[PDB]
Design a protein around this ligand. Structure first.
Ligand code: MG
Length: 261
RNA sequence: GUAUGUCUAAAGUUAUGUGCUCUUAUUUACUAACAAAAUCAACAUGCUAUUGAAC
């Protein structure tokens, strides 16, 4: 089989491999099976964009700080930015939920009931803030497994989210960062998203911000349907399955995109 | 407007050196000189979007 390293985004890897001081030693690093040149150069471009890397290709202190999180660099960028923006408290649990697979359960015949249960937690802005409402309601039900099942959400995913939240909180308290809450000013989170995800943006026909390729909201999204259409979009992943799908979706204002990048 | 052309049957030698029986065109169908300037009669009474393996 082709090794994972030859076929995945590598920016977590390159961040860490710069964070330990393997330099242009990284640019010539002895792997068994070297990743494609354009994969390396693209991950370098991503890190340069995020400001983890300078124009020569050398690590910034922001890079070194981000590398102490167990994270792909965007998710560390957004947490560090959430300190200065003052939403660390919400950002912790949203970044925690964004790490986790298969958060909702959607069995063969029951697509309606699974979504109906999810839609009790709906935020009109995004999937991202709907994840917050899920974790808050889960906790308000004393983290109940039976509530998880009732609402078609995977408890394994939720317990892992809380374990990640407490770990990331520990990492922030190791970096001495304050865990400030934004409260109901959820736009602060959405401004932070622009700091991490400015490449991962799209606009209604959706159409990618930089490459211009046309793309689709995944049908699980709170923003999908025979229905909703917010003009400007930021997203957690782009993925081709049956279609070229944005995996989950958040609405944005264009002014934030040139504010953060 | 159903092209048209050539050939031959000649003369023998011109004197010397009835059954049977198919058929709702089951035809090998043949000719193109003829004409070509075709559009009234259209069209239903109201527009759509959907699903990922695993760590
Ligand atoms: Mg004539």
């Amino acid at each position: 089989t082709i090794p994972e390293i030859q076929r995945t985004n590598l920016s977590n890897t390159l961040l860490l491999l710069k964070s330990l001081d393997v330099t242009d030693e990284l640019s010539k690093f002895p792997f068994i099976d070297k990743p494609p040149l354009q994969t390396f150069l693209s991950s370098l471009y991503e890190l340069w964009f995020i400001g983890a890397i300078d124009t020569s290709g050398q690590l910034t202190p922001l890079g070194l700080q981000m590398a102490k999180f167990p994270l792909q660099p965007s998710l560390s960028k957004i947490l560090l930015i959430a300190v200065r923006n003052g939403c660390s408290d919400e950002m912790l649990t949203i970044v925690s939920m964004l790490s986790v697979p298969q958060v909702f359960y959607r069995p063969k015949e029951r697509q309606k009931e699974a979504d109906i249960a999810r839609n009790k937690f709906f935020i009109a802005k995004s999937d991202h803030l709907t994840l917050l409402n899920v974790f808050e309601q889960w906790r308000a039900n004393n983290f109940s497994s039976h509530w998880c099942n009732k609402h078609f959400v995977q408890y394994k995913s939720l317990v892992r989210a809380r374990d990640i939240r407490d770990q990331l909180l520990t990492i922030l308290k190791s970096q001495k960062i304050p865990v400030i809450s934004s409260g109901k000013d959820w736009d602060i989170i959405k401004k932070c998203i622009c700091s991490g995800f400015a490449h991962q943006a799209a606009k209604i026909t959706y159409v990618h911000l930089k490459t211009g390729v046309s793309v689709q909201l995944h049908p699980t999204s709170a923003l999908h349907g025979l229905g909703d259409l917010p003009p400007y979009v930021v997203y957690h992943e782009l993925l081709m399955t049956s279609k070229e799908y944005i995996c989950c979706v958040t609405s944005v204002d264009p002014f934030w995109l040139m504010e953060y990048g």
